[PDB]
Design a protein. Structure first.
Ligand SMILES: [Mg+2]
Ligand SMILES: [Mg+2]
Ligand SMILES: [Mg+2]
Ligand SMILES: [Mg+2]
Ligand SMILES: [Mg+2]
Ligand SMILES: [Mg+2]
Ligand SMILES: [Mg+2]
Ligand SMILES: [Mg+2]
Ligand SMILES: [Mg+2]
Ligand SMILES: [Mg+2]
Ligand SMILES: [Mg+2]
Ligand SMILES: [Mg+2]
Ligand SMILES: [Mg+2]
Ligand SMILES: [Mg+2]
Ligand SMILES: [Mg+2]
Ligand SMILES: [Mg+2]
Ligand SMILES: [Mg+2]
Ligand SMILES: [Mg+2]
Ligand SMILES: [Mg+2]
Ligand SMILES: [Mg+2]
Ligand SMILES: [Mg+2]
Ligand SMILES: [Mg+2]
Ligand SMILES: [Mg+2]
Ligand SMILES: [Mg+2]
Ligand SMILES: [Mg+2]
Ligand SMILES: [Mg+2]
Ligand SMILES: [Mg+2]
Ligand SMILES: [Mg+2]
Ligand SMILES: [Mg+2]
Ligand SMILES: [Mg+2]
Ligand SMILES: [Mg+2]
Ligand SMILES: [Mg+2]
Ligand SMILES: [Mg+2]
Ligand SMILES: [Mg+2]
Ligand SMILES: [Mg+2]
Ligand SMILES: [Mg+2]
Ligand SMILES: [Mg+2]
Ligand SMILES: [Mg+2]
Ligand SMILES: [Mg+2]
Lengths: 223, 51, 185, 171, 56, 159
RNA sequence: GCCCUGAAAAUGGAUGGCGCUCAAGCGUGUUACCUAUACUCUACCGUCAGGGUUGAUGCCCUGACGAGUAGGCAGG
RNA sequence: AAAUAUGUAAGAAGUCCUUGUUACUUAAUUGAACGUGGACAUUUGAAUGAAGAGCUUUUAGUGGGCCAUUUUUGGUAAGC
RNA sequence: GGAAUACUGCCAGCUGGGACUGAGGACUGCGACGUAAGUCAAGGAUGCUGGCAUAAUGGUUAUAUGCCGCCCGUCUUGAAA
RNA sequence: GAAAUUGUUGAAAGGGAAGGGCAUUUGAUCAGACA
């Protein structure tokens, strides 16, 4: 009883030390994986140009959506789709895998939400500061990798950065890894929406619709 | 009992995600990419500056 | 403001404790709430909720019901658990021995297990013997044979029993009950 | 907004019947690349059988002015929609850069004819090579030799609410 | 005095309160309205395979 | 006064298609129907017996009975806040086999056989369709195709 | 296009008022700012829920939620 | 001959092999039903969500409505 | 021909000023910094110093100022009417 | 020996009602904490 605690203790202290350096190994491999991914696209664009061709980027697989409209006076079809994407509240936001199946859920929902393509720096800053998990209902703040590993470990993903990697890459467990994240409750943009009147397309005078790369500047003022 | 924001509070930034240490120490928030000389051919700029 | 997808502040439709004030019932609960919580023993859970049930939900199990259950293959030696009262049944003759765990036993039912060589056990006694509920058969009465259930779903062409204070011909037998006077139900 | 000039190139989606479909380009004036791509489609759908569903945008590249410090005379050809109908116009704008001129093109068409952005198609913008190919008197004014003019009645915006001397406009 | 005649207003909203249900699907459905011949026959066919399965 | 009849408002609905009139070809009489089949109800205005009421036109359901000239069909009709089960007696000219099931059955064969050629080689299955994925990176060339630049067009009257 | 004419009603009077003319007007563009019981974070009340643990209507941990006539229930 | 609306389907209550039952039906041991025994569960055969699903009893109040967008009928029109 | 700069974007880069908040109450957790012993900004504020020790804070109340507030009750699609 | 309602006395306020809410000033007043 007096000795066997140092048994169970020194045990976990080593299995912690082990899980730690695994994350330290993985996160290093993700850093290289991104750094080379972006770097290839840049040169591939250069190469096309030198060849007198045009490199067309692949369409984005990943889209972030925040609901910018109030909860009153919504048509019933969009009201469903809005719930089915878990944005029931103003400024709240989630991630969407981009397929034709959810592409039409962005068409129907368009006047009530602003969406675009989030950058790594966004997804990171989202998950660290506003990242919360779903554990038996209750909304759990993600402050310790064990919390992730507990729920998402069966998929891999023992680290908050494995979550962040799973998200930004889409890939195999995106459905589950994403649905684990509690919808991000964002504040209103600090510095404003930059347009007088929100509900009009981004093409038209801003706020609502697909602003593509510009979603990032937005979310980071809200977040 | 308190949410702490890893993007401040370095204790936490290290608590999640080591390699924060490595990142900072190796910089690579910076890190100049290598230097290549590819020039866009001809037709590209012919059409770029076209009417 | 939120657009809720479900009714807020909606309480679970299940009983959290029995509506009785019977202090011994409370004790039996206090036992099985401990039992259910600290053991795996799915048996304990079921009995826990069973103790909460309302009289209409605890229909008597007769002594013949227990007997025919023991005739299942390999069941002969299990000990029956009935959360509720057990009743005597004259209609059977040869009754086996075994053991029964119940809230209440009627006189006839007690004498009919005992005179068969069996034993009468309360649920706390059953608890000490089967803390995990080992080798138990759980029995429930036929709650849907109640009189009032005759009248539920009353309707045209529904075949149910009308609510009636008196019975016979000339009591709601005529117009609408027969092809010859108007229509038929 | 504050404008930029974009090159937008695109093409039909390729089919097994026809890989390598013909490419088309537009110079589009926009504030950002999202509007630009839309306005590519907007005219393309006027000129050709495509929806941005059946096409894709091959390349989008900004276009920076060739000589940003050289004052040039621009001809501008426009189709716009009045209240009672639709009209073609030629105006001249003397400015430093193609974007600079398209910016004040939209101000003019808004101010003089009350024509919002949605009404106006920019048909062509072309620097005027040779002086006295300039037709419009309100440019030709500034093309004269040794052009000097004063700026009379000068209003000095005041810092504090009260001033201690009767002000002067003199310059 | 004249008063409103008919309108469908709100009826969908009330509908979806508890509503739209489903058909309540079951295996071995109601045979109501099946051909009475082949019902008579299907009785003895089922009786036959049950007798045979007990004979083993 | 108001008129709601059994065939009320079926003028166009029960009209026969342009230039397909008169006798019903023999294929519709040679089809064979089994309990549990899925059928498409489209009434045939040249055959007045065994006729569906206009509501069920276009509706598809399962056949629960088979008789001499007809099939019974089961349709779920919503009335009020729930569906009610309806059983329809329809003559075989008003009925057709649903082609939707037919694609599904054919994919289960295809799925079973895919899983076999995979298990025989001991490799990954993935029999569930994925929706269209966004797209992949391309390099389009300029050889033979020089981008031909376009301009908006002046207003012109053509009248 | 803006401006003028076309343009006549009854107490005294309303771009909300004052007043405003390279506007404090009209068209359009760019920012900065003001502030809702709304969004974001914390504290507190309550409601529901999940979990732990031998004033048992108990003690504890955790999350979410809070409009309301007619009306139903509940604790007082 | 659209748009928006709308029916059905996307499996374990499935699929395949084998071969039992019957007074139905066939010229016919043919079919139609309902079965025994054997095989296939990784991705258990689109997406999204799901904070749970299903089920019963019983009873209040209401059964003057009115407004906005769009569709739209009568009327010159109406705060009809 | 070689630069620079704008623009846009990124940094697990460093730093100055202000505001509100300090829930919790032995210990347990995840960590960081150290060769080390230890240390820490790491599962919620502590240290140091001053004044007062009473109408001073505060409560009550009357008045004054700023902004705001139609008369309830009922029928009603609609009531300050 | 309550209320409506009234006399006197004492404090206060009042340029076409009065009365209400949030907040502080002022005046009046008053509880709470140490030997
Ligand atoms: Mg600000
Ligand atoms: Mg605004
Ligand atoms: Mg009347
Ligand atoms: Mg009525
Ligand atoms: Mg009529
Ligand atoms: Mg037709
Ligand atoms: Mg047709
Ligand atoms: Mg007839
Ligand atoms: Mg005036
Ligand atoms: Mg004003
Ligand atoms: Mg001006
Ligand atoms: Mg202006
Ligand atoms: Mg308030
Ligand atoms: Mg509880
Ligand atoms: Mg439980
Ligand atoms: Mg409990
Ligand atoms: Mg206890
Ligand atoms: Mg208790
Ligand atoms: Mg209580
Ligand atoms: Mg309790
Ligand atoms: Mg609320
Ligand atoms: Mg309430
Ligand atoms: Mg409510
Ligand atoms: Mg009623
Ligand atoms: Mg009435
Ligand atoms: Mg009105
Ligand atoms: Mg350079
Ligand atoms: Mg910069
Ligand atoms: Mg404290
Ligand atoms: Mg004070
Ligand atoms: Mg007022
Ligand atoms: Mg009244
Ligand atoms: Mg009345
Ligand atoms: Mg009133
Ligand atoms: Mg008095
Ligand atoms: Mg008097
Ligand atoms: Mg006083
Ligand atoms: Mg006063
Ligand atoms: Mg307040």
């Amino acid at each position: 009883t007096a000795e066997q605690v140092a048994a169970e203790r020194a045990a976990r202290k080593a299995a912690n030390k082990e899980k730690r350096a695994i994350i330290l190994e993985r996160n290093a491999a993700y850093q290289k994986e991104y750094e080379t991914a972006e770097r290839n696209i840049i040169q591939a664009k250069r190469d096309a140009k030198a060849a007198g061709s045009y490199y067309v980027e692949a369409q984005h697989k990943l889209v972030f959506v925040v609901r910018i409209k109030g909860i009153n006076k919504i048509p019933p079809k969009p009201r469903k789709v809005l719930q089915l994407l878990r944005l029931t509240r103003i400024n709240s936001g989630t991630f969407v895998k981009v397929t034709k199946a959810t592409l039409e859920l962005l068409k129907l929902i368009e006047p009530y939400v602003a969406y675009g393509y989030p950058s790594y720096s966004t997804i990171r800053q989202l998950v660290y500061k506003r990242g919360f998990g779903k554990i038996n209902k209750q909304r759990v703040p993600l402050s310790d990798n064990a919390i992730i590993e507990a729920n998402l470990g069966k998929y891999g993903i023992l680290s908050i950065d494995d979550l962040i990697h799973e998200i930004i890459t889409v890939g195999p467990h995106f459905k589950q890894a994403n649905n684990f994240l509690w919808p991000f409750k964002l504040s209103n943009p600090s510095g404003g929406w930059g347009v007088p009147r929100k509900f009009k397309h981004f093409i038209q005078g801003g706020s609502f619709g697909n602003r593509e790369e510009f979603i990032n500047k937005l979310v980071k003022s809200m977040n | 009992v308190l949410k702490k924001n890893p993007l401040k509070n370095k204790q936490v930034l290290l608590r999640l995600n080591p390699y924060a240490k490595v990142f900072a120490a190796e910089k690579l928030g910076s890190k100049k990419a290598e230097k290549t000389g590819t020039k866009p051919a001809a037709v590209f700029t012919e059409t770029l500056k076209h009417d | 403001g939120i657009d809720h997808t479900s009714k807020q502040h909606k309480r679970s439709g299940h009983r959290t404790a029995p509506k009785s004030d019977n202090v011994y019932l409370k004790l039996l609960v206090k036992l099985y709430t401990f039992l259910a919580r600290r053991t795996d023993a799915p048996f304990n859970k079921v009995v826990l909720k069973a103790l909460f049930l309302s009289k209409i939900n605890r229909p008597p199990v007769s002594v013949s019901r227990i007997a025919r259950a023991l005739k299942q293959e390999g069941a002969a030696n299990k000990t029956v658990v009935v959360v509720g009262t057990v009743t005597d049944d004259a209609r059977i003759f040869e009754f086996p021995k075994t053991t029964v765990a119940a809230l209440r036993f009627t006189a006839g039912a007690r004498a009919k297990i005992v005179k068969a060589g069996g034993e009468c056990i309360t649920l706390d006694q059953l608890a000490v013997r089967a803390p995990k509920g080992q080798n138990t058969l759980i029995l429930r009465g036929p709650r849907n044979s109640r009189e009032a259930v005759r009248h539920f779903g009353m309707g045209p062409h529904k075949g149910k029993a009308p609510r009636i204070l008196s019975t016979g011909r000339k009591f709601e037998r005529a117009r609408g009950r027969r092809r010859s006077k108007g229509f038929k139900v | 907004a504050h404008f930029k000039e974009y090159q937008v190139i695109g093409r039909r989606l390729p089919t097994e019947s026809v890989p390598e479909p013909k490419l088309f380009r537009m110079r589009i004036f926009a504030s950002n690349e999202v509007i630009a791509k839309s306005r590519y489609w907007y005219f393309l759908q006027k000129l050709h059988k495509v929806k941005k569903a059946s096409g894709e945008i091959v390349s989008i590249n900004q276009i920076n002015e060739a000589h940003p410090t050289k004052v040039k005379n621009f001809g501008v050809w426009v189709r716009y929609d009045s209240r009672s109908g639709t009209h073609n116009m030629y105006k001249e704008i003397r400015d430093v850069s193609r974007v600079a001129a398209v910016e004040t093109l939209y101000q003019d068409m808004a101010a003089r004819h009350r024509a919002r952005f949605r009404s106006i198609h920019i048909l062509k913008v072309a620097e005027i090579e040779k002086t006295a190919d300039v037709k419009r008197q309100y440019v030709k004014q500034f093309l004269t030799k040794d052009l000097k003019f004063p700026l009379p009645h000068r209003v000095q915006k005041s810092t504090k609410t009260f001033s201690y001397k009767r002000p002067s406009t003199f310059y | 005095a004249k008063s409103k005649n008919h309108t469908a207003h709100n009826q969908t909203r009330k509908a979806h309160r508890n509503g739209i249900k489903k058909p309540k699907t079951y295996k071995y459905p109601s045979l109501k309205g099946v051909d009475p011949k082949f019902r008579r026959n299907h009785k003895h066919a089922l009786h036959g395979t049950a007798k045979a399965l007990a004979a083993a | 006064g108001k008129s709601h009849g059994y065939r009320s408002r079926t003028r166009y609905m029960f009209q026969r298609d342009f230039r397909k009139h008169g006798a019903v070809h023999l294929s519709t009489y040679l089809k064979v129907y089994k309990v549990g089949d899925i059928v498409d109800i489209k009434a045939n205005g040249s055959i007045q017996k065994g006729m569906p009421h206009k509501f069920y036109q276009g509706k598809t359901g399962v056949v629960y009975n088979v008789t001499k000239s007809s099939v019974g069909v089961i349709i779920n009709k919503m009335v009020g806040n729930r569906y009610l089960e309806k059983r329809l007696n329809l003559r075989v000219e008003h009925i057709k086999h649903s082609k939707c099931r037919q694609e599904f059955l054919e994919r289960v064969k295809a799925n079973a056989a895919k899983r076999a050629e995979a298990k025989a080689q001991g490799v990954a299955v993935q029999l569930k369709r994925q929706p269209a994925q966004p797209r992949e990176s391309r390099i389009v060339s300029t050889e033979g195709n020089v981008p031909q630049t376009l301009a908006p067009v002046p207003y012109e009257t053509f009248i």
